[PDB]
Design an enzyme around this catalytic site. Structure first.
Site, PDB file in Angstrom:
ATOM      1  N   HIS B  41      37.178  82.454-111.594  1.00 59.21           N
ATOM      2  CA  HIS B  41      35.896  82.552-110.856  1.00 59.21           C
ATOM      3  C   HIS B  41      35.410  83.939-110.466  1.00 59.21           C
ATOM      4  CE1 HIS B  41      38.479  82.214-107.106  1.00 59.21           C
ATOM      5  NE2 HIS B  41      37.529  83.198-106.653  1.00 59.21           N
ATOM      6  N   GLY B 143      37.565  88.064-101.052  1.00 57.42           N
ATOM      7  CA  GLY B 143      38.330  89.594-101.627  1.00 57.42           C
ATOM      8  C   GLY B 143      39.614  89.194-102.140  1.00 57.42           C
ATOM      9  N   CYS B 145      41.312  86.933-103.481  1.00 62.41           N
ATOM     10  CA  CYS B 145      41.647  85.879-104.381  1.00 62.41           C
ATOM     11  C   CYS B 145      42.264  86.883-105.532  1.00 62.41           C
ATOM     12  CB  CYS B 145      40.316  85.413-105.042  1.00 62.41           C
ATOM     13  SG  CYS B 145      39.780  84.092-104.017  1.00 62.41           S
TER      14      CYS B 145
HETATM   15  C1  LIG Z   1      38.138  84.163-103.206  1.00 60.23           C
HETATM   16  O1  LIG Z   1      37.298  85.186-102.875  1.00 60.23           O
HETATM   17  C2  LIG Z   1      38.477  83.202-102.151  1.00 60.23           C
HETATM   18  C3  LIG Z   1      38.352  83.802-100.713  1.00 60.23           C
HETATM   19  C4  LIG Z   1      38.059  82.828 -99.963  1.00 60.23           C
HETATM   20  C5  LIG Z   1      37.057  83.267 -98.688  1.00 60.23           C
HETATM   21  C6  LIG Z   1      37.586  82.976 -97.319  1.00 60.23           C
HETATM   22  N1  LIG Z   1      39.068  82.636 -97.778  1.00 60.23           N
HETATM   23  C7  LIG Z   1      39.405  82.344 -98.764  1.00 60.23           C
HETATM   24  O2  LIG Z   1      40.558  82.226 -99.259  1.00 60.23           O
HETATM   25  N2  LIG Z   1      37.551  82.043-102.377  1.00 60.23           N
HETATM   26  C8  LIG Z   1      36.321  81.808-102.852  1.00 60.23           C
HETATM   27  O3  LIG Z   1      35.520  82.344-103.024  1.00 60.23           O
HETATM   28  C9  LIG Z   1      36.261  80.440-103.671  1.00 60.23           C
HETATM   29  C10 LIG Z   1      35.528  80.498-104.690  1.00 60.23           C
HETATM   30  C11 LIG Z   1      35.604  78.964-105.655  1.00 60.23           C
HETATM   31  C12 LIG Z   1      36.904  78.654-105.473  1.00 60.23           C
HETATM   32  C13 LIG Z   1      34.801  78.998-106.918  1.00 60.23           C
HETATM   33  N3  LIG Z   1      35.627  79.487-102.614  1.00 60.23           N
HETATM   34  C14 LIG Z   1      36.170  79.017-101.394  1.00 60.23           C
HETATM   35  O4  LIG Z   1      37.273  79.222-101.131  1.00 60.23           O
HETATM   36  C15 LIG Z   1      35.437  78.343-100.533  1.00 60.23           C
HETATM   37  N4  LIG Z   1      36.048  77.064-100.205  1.00 60.23           N
HETATM   38  C16 LIG Z   1      35.465  76.144-101.171  1.00 60.23           C
HETATM   39  O5  LIG Z   1      34.493  75.837-101.602  1.00 60.23           O
HETATM   40  O6  LIG Z   1      36.522  74.581-100.945  1.00 60.23           O
HETATM   41  C17 LIG Z   1      36.083  73.532-100.626  1.00 60.23           C
HETATM   42  C18 LIG Z   1      34.903  73.243 -99.820  1.00 60.23           C
HETATM   43  C19 LIG Z   1      35.385  73.265 -98.369  1.00 60.23           C
HETATM   44  C20 LIG Z   1      34.474  73.239 -97.375  1.00 60.23           C
HETATM   45  C21 LIG Z   1      33.054  73.217 -97.696  1.00 60.23           C
HETATM   46  C22 LIG Z   1      32.819  73.148 -98.835  1.00 60.23           C
HETATM   47  C23 LIG Z   1      33.780  73.288-100.242  1.00 60.23           C
HETATM   48  C24 LIG Z   1      35.061  78.791 -98.896  1.00 60.23           C
HETATM   49  C25 LIG Z   1      34.548  80.290 -99.223  1.00 60.23           C
HETATM   50  C26 LIG Z   1      34.397  77.816 -98.137  1.00 60.23           C
END
Ligand SMILES: *[C@H](O)[C@@H](C[C@@H]1CCNC1=O)NC(=O)[C@H](CC(C)C)NC(=O)[C@@H](NC(=O)OCc1ccccc1)C(C)C
Ligand SMILES: *[C@H](O)[C@@H](C[C@@H]1CCNC1=O)NC(=O)[C@H](CC(C)C)NC(=O)[C@@H](NC(=O)OCc1ccccc1)C(C)C
EC number: 3.4.19.12
Lengths: 306, 306
Positions: B41, B143, B145
């Protein structure tokens, strides 16, 4: 989000660990520039340790009695001296992996990472706090002596602890890198009192702020209190008295969360008086005191090093 | 003595962390030989993440759209491909700090160390367990990830986890280094259920053995039980059923302490039924399940790496 007891990355310190042998005793040393630092009791037999005259024992030793081994690189010892409870072995080679470093004497309530080592090889890394009674609650076996505690500021390693001994509590005592013990301890195998410990109040509050930042807010009550009022509850539960210096240190966390320090104190007071009722905070059923305000801020702002 | 949640020394992994940028998104990559591994991603905008077609998005990218930065050493990208949920960027330079390594897919209940990183620079290291529901309880910000989890066997780093996302619980999900998620998760910003977690019974028992080794023995009761009898108490308290494979794994700790596994089970059963009554075990007021039997043995035998 999430909150974990996090140690510093240990790579810069790994490059400095060596094995020091004198007679049959082997322990860890710290190799920085052309000096190796290690506990002076490396020169003792098992019997010497009951009441060692370190000056008399060291006089029987010469440079070639000290075997310093760095992995399999092995160092020539060209000078030795005793500084308080550490030996300084001068070697003919500067450690090519020496990081930017400093020797610091930390204060009770501060935290640092420990790199636990045996025969000069790292085994594990973990975080802890210098207790108010100048002990630490570590994980140390025979041969771990000379393992060090440290903090990192970007590229600078501040060494603050060298391990020497275990006390009749399962707690641990050691020196700074000038060889001065933290606390009243001496490097002799004789019964030694640590004295009453206390809980690090400012660290508990920092951890409550961590909890709020991460969504755990059930303990946020309704009351407030005063410093005096809280400090009276503090002594009953054997907590360090809170000072205005501590309130100021908690300023950034107070501003980030919008919770006044004295309001957080009123929450802490109720937790001390009524317990947690089988609930948990940040995955713990006890009030945690081994995160400083700085620890919380670095973990919730993502500070890096290299 | 003493018992701490101890991570592996992180130096070998620090040497492999790089920063990967595509467009405005920056995350961490793992540089091994001439390949950099990172979450796919990295190619998404904030809006793409709601429902990304990764194949279509990747087609718009070319080698020169990926900026890989190792400290300030900066790498030329000469090939890219997507393997499941990871990107593999081929670079023109082999990492001179590449350790002996392996990619492994760990099992639920196993533990590993996490090196948390931002912009390719390490921030901290901590230990945890792959939960039975294939989440981890980490500490991860924006950040982070691309940060990885790993174990060390002397000189060999076994990489087992790359971080991808946070779930609506504050828990964390990610992939192995072939890009396959642990658990049912997908890399999309959409609500996702983790499912019921359970406590890792064999790890709790290992930790009770750790406690006895370190002098905490108040919970050692008088009773015994059977596997069946204990497994009935297990399901009530949402513990994994104990198997003979688990009993065998606990053999060395049983032999070291002279306590039969089924006797320890009877102690655990009483702790589950009656609680701890405000006492603590190894400094905890909860039953801990993130130490494997191997973790306990390495910490009480002093195993080293390098
Ligand atoms: C990479 O930057 C990573 C870091 C995140 C931010 C805060 N803690 C972390 O571990 N995460 C991401 O940006 C993810 C990118 C996706 C996989 C394309 N997104 C997320 O981790 C988001 N969570 C998520 O979408 O999981 C399911 C969900 C849960 C609750 C509501 C809606 C969806 C999170 C930033 C919320
Ligand atoms: C270095 O090997 C180091 C490792 C110890 C072994 C177990 N845990 C550790 O941290 N300790 C030593 O060998 C010490 C050498 C001394 C400083 C010359 N000795 C000890 O740590 C001993 N403790 C001790 O003497 O402290 C006071 C005391 C307490 C209880 C009874 C008698 C004296 C321990 C090995 C007991």
């Amino acid at each position: 989000s999430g909150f974990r007891k996090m140690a510093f990355p240990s790579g810069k310190v790994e490059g400095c660990m060596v094995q020091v042998t004198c007679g049959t005793t082997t322990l860890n040393g710290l190799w920085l520039d052309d000096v190796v630092y290690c506990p002076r009791h490396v020169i003792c037999t098992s019997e010497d340790m009951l009441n060692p005259n370190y000056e008399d024992l060291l006089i029987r030793k010469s440079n070639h009695n000290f075997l310093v081994q760095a992995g399999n690189v092995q160092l020539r010892v060209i000078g030795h001296s005793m500084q308080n409870c550490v030996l300084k072995l001068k070697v003919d080679t500067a450690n090519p992996k020496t990081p930017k470093y400093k020797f610091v004497r930390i204060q009770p309530g501060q935290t640092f990472s420990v790199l636990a080592c045996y025969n000069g090889s790292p085994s594990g890394v973990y975080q802890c706090a210098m207790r108010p009674n100048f002990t630490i609650k570590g994980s140390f076996l025979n041969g771990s002596c000379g393992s060090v505690g440290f903090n990192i500021d970007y590229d600078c390693v501040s060494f603050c602890y060298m391990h020497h001994m275990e006390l009749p509590t399962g707690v641990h005592a050691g020196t700074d890198l000038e060889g001065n013990f933290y606390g009243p301890f001496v490097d002799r195998q004789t019964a030694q009192a640590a004295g009453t410990d206390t809980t690090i109040t400012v660290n508990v509050l920092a951890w409550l702020y961590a909890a709020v930042i991460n969504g755990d807010r059930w303990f946020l009550n309704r009351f407030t209190t005063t410093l005096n009022d809280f400090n009276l509850v503090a002594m009953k539960y054997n907590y360090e008295p809170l000072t205005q210096d501590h309130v100021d240190i908690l300023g950034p966390l107070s501003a980030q969360t919008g919770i006044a320090v004295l309001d957080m104190c009123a929450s802490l007071k109720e937790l001390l008086q009524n317990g947690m009722n089988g609930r948990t905070i940040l995955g713990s059923a006890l009030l945690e005191d081994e995160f400083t305000p700085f620890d919380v801020v670095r973990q919730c702002s993502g500070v890096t090093f290299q």
